[PDB]
Amino acid sequence: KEYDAYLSYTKVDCDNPEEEQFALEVLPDVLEKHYGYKLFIPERDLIPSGTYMEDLTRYVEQSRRLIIVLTPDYILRRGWSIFELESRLHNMLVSGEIKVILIECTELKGKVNCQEVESLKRSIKLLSLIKWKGSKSSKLNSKFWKHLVYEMPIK
């Protein structure tokens, strides 16, 4: 309906080098300036109110994609939980009703860790897995950036 992507990352005030800058700075800037998509970024676009759970829910419904940025802080704080604790959000993931682009920025070191993630992948009906290879992919006009833009909606 009203957004081309909901953007799900984790920020803490911490296991992240240059990765943090890609997932907090360059990624939303490049998609929303240099390609002009419209993103819903929770730390711009949503006050924590008493209705936060249903606010966040009713914004995912209005988003054409779900981007999930697997910074190691995300695997730390299991950033995906919101999307499995909320009932409607869950079924949307398993029913195909929402397309999930999952930007993988690190190697899943973590025997437990590696397995939870596969049940995430399991539980999403429509999944794209795009791999971020450092500054190398961050360099605009890259192989990562093209891989990402038609996984985004039409123009």
Swiss-Prot record:
Tissue: Detected at low levels in fetal and adult brain, in particular in the frontal lobe, temporal lobe and cerebellum. Detected at very low levels in skin, liver, fetal ovary and in placenta.
Active site feature: E84
Localization of this protein: Membrane
Domain TIR, residue spans: 1-152
Domain characteristics, as noted in the entry: The TIR domain mediates NAD(+) hydrolase (NADase) activity. Self-association of TIR domains is required for NADase activity.
Family: Belongs to the interleukin-1 receptor family.
Descriptive protein name: X-linked interleukin-1 receptor accessory protein-like 2
Parent-record interval covered: 400 to 559 of 686
